[PDB]
Amino acid sequence: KQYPIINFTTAGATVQSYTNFIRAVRGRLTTGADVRHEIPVLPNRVGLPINQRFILVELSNHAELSVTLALDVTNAYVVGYRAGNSAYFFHPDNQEDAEAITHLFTDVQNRYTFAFGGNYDRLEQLAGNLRENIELGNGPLEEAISALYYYSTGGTQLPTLARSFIICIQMISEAARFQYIEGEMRTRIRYNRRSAPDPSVITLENSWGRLSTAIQESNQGAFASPIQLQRRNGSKFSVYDVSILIPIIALMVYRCAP
Ligand SMILES: O=C(O)c1cc2c(s1)-c1ccccc1CC2
Ligand SMILES: [Cl-]
Ligand SMILES: [Cl-]
Ligand SMILES: [Cl-]
């Protein structure tokens, strides 16, 4: 009757407890994934039955407020969330996706669809801040959870809601997609720090779709043409093959193979 749920709280969160959480998220996402090749491929959108389409992530904090994010298993991205008796959805791209989300949170009294989508370019505009200037960490995540809840009571304004999406998406969706970004978050939790992400994280996020295409279209592991990434100091380098990214990227959106 309900999609699978993973739980996480920032209250007393540790390196261990955040590691368990991301591992469970990856586990639910890859139930239907293709794991025969070097890197797991998320289920194909086309033909996926509706009862396999979503998973739910339920978050709480020291103030013991709770919100629940809905994640698409085909791309591990947040499509919307529930707070109290209300559900809120990013604007869908097409009719099929609009129909799919009517199967989420079917028991809330109030359903709203934002005019905007959930991509970073738009969310950065609404927040008034680039990812480069939005701190990540347990502290920021705790604050993001309260902000998401209080949107349903009129206590949160849309720019702060946008910045809270940016924090949640990166610390959950992107940390599940990339072992590399999980480690970046793990270091922040370990030393009790909050800091904005460096250029390597942002460029990895911006490249996930392109890397999924290059990997699944590769021939004997070799890319048909290079993809350019950044080190943490902003310097640039090229990747040419699948293998060097096996420790870096954990999940891929389905791509056709010629
Ligand atoms: O700051 C650094 O030293 C590095 C950052 C990255 C490196 S190295 C990398 C090396 C191979 C393959 C993918 C990556 C992703 C980001
Ligand atoms: Cl480890
Ligand atoms: Cl809806
Ligand atoms: Cl808009």
UniProtKB/Swiss-Prot annotation:
It catalyses: Endohydrolysis of the N-glycosidic bond at one specific adenosine on the 28S rRNA. It comes from the Eukaryota. Changing R45A: No effect on the toxic activity but suppresses the vascular leak syndrome. AMP binds at Y77, V78, G118, N119, Y120. A deglycosylated form may be linked to monoclonal antibodies to produce immunotoxins exploited in cancer treatment. However, a point mutation should be introduced to eliminate vascular leak syndrome, a side effect resulting from endothelial damage. The active site is at Y77, Y120, E174, R177. Glycans are attached at N7, N233. A carbohydrate binds at I5, I6, N7, G12, G47, N138, G139, P140, L141, E142, E143, N192, R193, R194. Acts as a glycosidase that removes a specific adenine residue from an exposed loop of the 28S rRNA (A4324 in mammals), leading to rRNA breakage. As this loop is involved in elongation factor binding, modified ribosomes are catalytically inactive and unable to support protein synthesis. Can inactivate a few thousand ribosomes per minute, faster than the cell can make new ones. Therefore a single molecule can kill an animal cell. This is Ricin A chain. It comes from Ricinus communis (Castor bean). The chain holds residues 39 to 296 of 576 of the full protein.
